[PDB]
Amino acid sequence: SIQAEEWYFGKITRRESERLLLNAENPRGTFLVRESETTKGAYCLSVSDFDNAKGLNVKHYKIRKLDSGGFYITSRTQFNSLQQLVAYYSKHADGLCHRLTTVCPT
Template sequence: MAAALPVCYHGAMTKKECEDLLGKKNKDGAYLIRDSETIQGAMCLCVYKQKVVYTYRLLQSHNGYYTLLTAGGLDETFFKTIDDLIRHYKRKNQGLAMHLRHSVKRKTALLIQPQRELQAQPSKSPEQRPHYENVMQHLLHFEFSLKK
């Protein structure tokens, strides 16, 4: 059975919808988690600071641990649950533009099974299983494409 997702998880939400919602909250350190629009199976941790929304990729490794892609040069830290990750980033000076302070909770129940829970189910062959490394390849390709 998949772990419960935190109430700050909003599922499928566009970047614009996220920015609007965090902007209405208008509090530095307001945050939510949404599905990535560009990387299948990844999520985004979005944090509001001084009218700007900072977005960090939230990835799950092949062994089920979670990590954030933060500022370059910082060591990757892995967490057993998303709640553990959130607790860690509530502390100051952990690599985010602003530490997490105000969870923006979803107002409605999620009616469909999140995509990453579907992917976590056993697949027929190792090639079909999602891997953290595969997500990283897509992310690096996407970032490279943006630089062109």
């Protein structure tokens, strides 16, 4: 759980996530989950996007974790695990820049 997850990069900075995601070869939705730099207990979901307006770019979303157990970006849409959250957002874009597609290559 989490650390076993290949999309879990653990303790890497926001800048490092952008370095990895800003690769021209990455299609929209390339992603990774990492620790937040300053929000304790929260993780960050970093996602690549692309459009003709900005071109290749990166968005960061905070994944909150309750002691009650749930994981969520928006409190209205919660999951029993980080894994289920990733699987859901791989199917639904909802408010994200793109549905999660491919785990970010190192």
